[model samples]
Target: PDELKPFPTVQQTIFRGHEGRVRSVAIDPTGVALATGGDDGTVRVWELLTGEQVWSVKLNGDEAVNTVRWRPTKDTFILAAAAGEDIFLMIPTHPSVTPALDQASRDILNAGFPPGKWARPGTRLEDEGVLLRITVRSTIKAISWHRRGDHFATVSPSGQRSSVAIHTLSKHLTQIPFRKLNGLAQTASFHPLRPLFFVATQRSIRCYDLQKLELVKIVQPGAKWISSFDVHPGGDNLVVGSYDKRLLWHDLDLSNRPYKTMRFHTEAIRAVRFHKGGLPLFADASDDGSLQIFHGKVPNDQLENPTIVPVKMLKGHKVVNKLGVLDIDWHPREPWCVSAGADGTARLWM
Candidate 1:
C-alpha cells in the first residue's frame, strides 16, 4: 500500500542510528551540513550535499532535543541538547576536523583576547573548555537566531517559572529576561530584521521586544494549547497550530483580528513552517498522520483573507499516537521535506 510505495531510504546519505526517534533537523547557513537531534539523547551532524554521517555528540538527558539552528554568518551553531533537566552545547562540529582557519576565522572565534587571556576573534580553542558554555535553567523547548546572529533566544519547559531569555553570544555575554507566563513555552521565532520576537506556550502566544527585553503583547485567542508556530519571512504575519485542532493566522504588527483561521484536523496540529520565498506560504503536519501546506497571497490587500490552501496531504506512519509529526523541516534547495515522529523513523521526501 501507500506505506510501502517506494520504501523511504536515505537518498542523500545515512547519518546513522538513533535508539529512539529523531526530533529535529536544521541546515547550517551555507547549507553545507545538517544537524539532527533525537530521543536517543544525542545530536548528529551530516553532510547536507550527500547525507553522509560526520559525527555525533551525546547529551546528558534521555528526553528529545527540542531545537537546532545554524548561526547566520558562520558554520558554527548553537543547539539546545538535553542533559537531564538542562541543556548543553554541541560545539564546533568536531572542530579539530574542520579546515585550517584563516585570519578572519580566527577573528570571529575570538575577538582577540590577551595572551594568557582569551584568544582573539576567529580563534578556536585548542582546548574545548575555551568555548563559552553556559547552562540554562530548565528543559529547552525552542531556539532561534536573529538576523545579525549576535544574539539568540530560548524558551524553557521546566515548571512554574517557565519563560524566555535572550542571550548575547560574544565572550562577555549578558541575558535579558522576558517574563514568566506560568506554563511551558514550546516554540519561538525571531523577526528577520526587526527587534521583535514571538514565542508560544500551550495556551497562548506572546510578542517581545529584544531591545527592551520586555513582553510587548500576549494573544490568548482562547487556544487550548498552541503546539507550534512560524513567522512569515517577509511580513509581520504569524501562523500557529494548537491542541484544539485549529490553525490561527494573525497580524502581529496590526493587532486587529486574525487574517485567517481554519480547522483541518480532528487532532492537534504538530508542526508548522513557512515556505522560504516570495509569497505567504507554509506547511503543517497533524496528529492524523497527514501533512498539509497553506499558502497566502500578497501585493493585494493583506486582509484579503490569506489563501489558506492545503497543497499536500502525506500519510505514511502507522498509529501516529502521541507524536503526530514529532517534527518537520524543509530542504534548502529541492522541493522536498523531512518529518519525524514517535514511529521511531525519520523520512525524507521529494
Candidate 2:
C-alpha cells in the first residue's frame, strides 16, 4: 500500500515523580517542556529531551487535576490547568526569557470585567507557577483553546446552559455558547482555522458554527461512550475514541459515517491525538496499557482517499486499577510522544 511510514521509537524515558496516578499531559509548542496534571491535584513540568523535573505546583489538596494545555504560542509560555471547579493560568519560568515576559503574563488577568470569576491567588499560589485561578460554578471536564491565543473554551457539566463556556482572555468576557445541549459534554474543541466548535456527547459529535450559532454538522460514531477525540490539523478530518474500545476516523464532507472504524484495543480508549508538526501520524491511548500509532495521510488528489496504516504499538505503562494510559500529546516539532499513565508515571517516547 502507498502510505506514510513512521520512524521507529528507539529511546523511552519514564518520569515517576507523581505521588498519585497521572491524568493529563501536554507538551509546550517548542516541545522543550512536558506539562502534566494528575490524581494528586498537582501540575508538574519536565524537560522533554531530558527526563529532568523542571517545575511543579499543587493546585488543591483534595481535587485532582483534570487537564492541562499550553497556549500553543512560541512567544510566551502559558499553561491552562483545570482542577475541581476552577481553571488556573500560569506562566512557567522560562530560560533566557525577557524581563517583560513575566509582566506580560501578569497582565493577562488584569481586566475590568469577567464572565467566570477571575481573582488573584494568594502569594502561596503565585510565587510558584500559579499566576491566578478562574472559578467556574460547575465541574470542568477538559480545556480547549482556539487557534488564536486570546480566546478559549471550557467543557463543563456545571449548570443547565453552561455545558460549554467560551472565554476571551483579552476582553475578559465569557459566553455560554450553547442555548441547550443534548446532554453533558464529554469534551469540546475549536476548529483549527475556522470559527467552528465541536461538542461531543456519549454517542455523537456535533459541530456548531460560531458565526451562525447553528448546527453545521454532526458525526455519529456508533460508540457506546465517547472517551476522547481530536481534529486533524488540516481541518477536514476528525478522529474519536470510545469506551467500547473503538477508534473511528471521520471525513468532514464524506458523510455521517466513519471513513475508517478501527478496533484493536482490548480495553477502553482514553485519548486520541493527531500530530501536525510534520509527520502524518495519529495515536490512540487505551486502558490496555498501550499506545497505538498510525500513519494517516490525507491525499491531495481529488480521486484518492485517506491512507491509514497501523504503524506500531508502543506499550510500557503498567495497568493500575485496570486503567493504563490516561492522556497523550505529541511533540510539536518532533516525532516523539508524551503520555500520562495510571501507574503514577509519565513517559516520553521517541
Candidate 3:
C-alpha cells in the first residue's frame, strides 16, 4: 500500500493581467501556447516557456469568457473561446503561426456555410488575427474539440434543452445535437480515440454514438452538481468532480455506480481533467484554491481494477469572493499544469 507514495509540485510561473477571475486555461497540442479565458471579457494567449502574455483579444466588454480551447491541431494554432453569447475561432499570430499554416486554417474554416449568424468584430479585431465570430443564444460554458480537431461541442446550460451544440470549422457550422431536454448540458467531451460523445447534466453523464445516432449509456455518479469529468486515456473509466464535495471514479464495464469516491477539499470542486497524452495522472481543482493530483494507473487487463493514489496537493491561487481555482489544463507533452483562478491570475506548476 505504501509503494505508490505521493509527490510534490513546485510552483513555477504566474500569468498576470486579467482584472477579474481567470476562468479557464488550455495548453495547445504543440505545447507552445497557453490560452486563458477570463471574466475580464478577454481571451489571452501566453508563451509556454517564458510565461509572458503574447496576444490578447476582447470578445465583448465585461462579458466573461467561460471557456477557451486550442483546437487539437498540432500543425498550427487555432483558438476557440466562448464569451457572452458568441463563440470565437481565431488563428492567433503566435510563433506557431506560419504563413502556410495560417492560410490553410483560414481556408478550412471558410470552407463551410456558416449555420449561425457571424457577429460583428471589434474595430481592429478582424485584421488582428480574428477569423470567425459565431453568435449563439446564450453564454457558452464549455468547449470540447473532436479528435480530428475540426468538429467540437459547445455547452450552454441556460439555453434549456438546446444547450449542447456541435460546431465545426470544416463546415463553419453549429447545430444543437440534442433537441429535447433531459436537463441542461453543462459540459460535453469527445472521446480521445473513439467516436463517442459524452454530455454531463446536473447529475448524470450521457454517452452518445454520433455515427449510429443513439444514446450509448448513462452514468449516475451520485453527485448533486457535477462540475467536470474526464474520460481515462483507456476509454473505459472516468473521473468526475462535483460541487457536492465529491470526486468519483466510474468504470464503464462495471455498474453505473462510481468505483471510488473522494473528497479532500473543504469546498466545491470546479475543474477536473485527465492527462490528454496518456499520462497515468489526473487532477481536480477546488474552490479552496488547491488542486489534488492523483497517480491513476489503468492496467492493461480489462479485468484488473485501476489503482489511484493522491500524489500532490498544489496550492498557490488566492480565493477571491469565495471563489478559487476556476479551471486548469495540463501541458500536452509534459507533466506541467496551468491553473486559472478567481484571483485574476493564472499560474504554472511543474
Candidate 2: 10-residue stretch with minimal lDDT? 1-10
Checking candidate 2 for backbone clashes, the offending pairs are 9-350, 138-158
The TM-score of predicted model 1 comes to: 0.78
Candidate 1 yields a Cα-based lDDT of 0.60
Cα error, residue 258 of model 1, in Å, equals: 2.9
lDDT of 2 by residue, 1-350 (tens): 24455543543788878877898999988778889898899898887777788788888878999899988777767899999878998887666246787676666655434338777776888888687688777878889988777778888765655678887888766778666787768889899888899999877899999868899899998888889899988788889999989899998768788889998899999999999775789999999889988888777754258888888888878998878899999988778888888989999887
Every model's Cα RMSD, please? Answer: 6.1, 1.9, 1.9
Model 3 lDDT per residue over 57-76, tens place: 88776789889988787765
Ranking by lDDT: 3, 2, 1
Stretches of candidate 3 above 4 Å error?
1-8, 113-115, 118-123
User: What lDDT does model 3 reach?
Assistant: 0.83
Question: Could you give candidate 1's per-residue lDDT for residues 1-350 as a string of tens digits?
Answer: 23212222232333347666667777655545667777787677776556666667655334666666655655344443433334444354544334443333434445423001221212332232123334555666777777777777666666434346666656534353566666678877788667888877786777777667777888764677678888777646778877778878876656645566788876778788765544444667777766665555443565444445555567774334455666666665444566665565555554
lDDT score, residue 68, model 3? 93
Candidate 2 to truth, TM: 0.95
lDDT of 3 at 335: 80
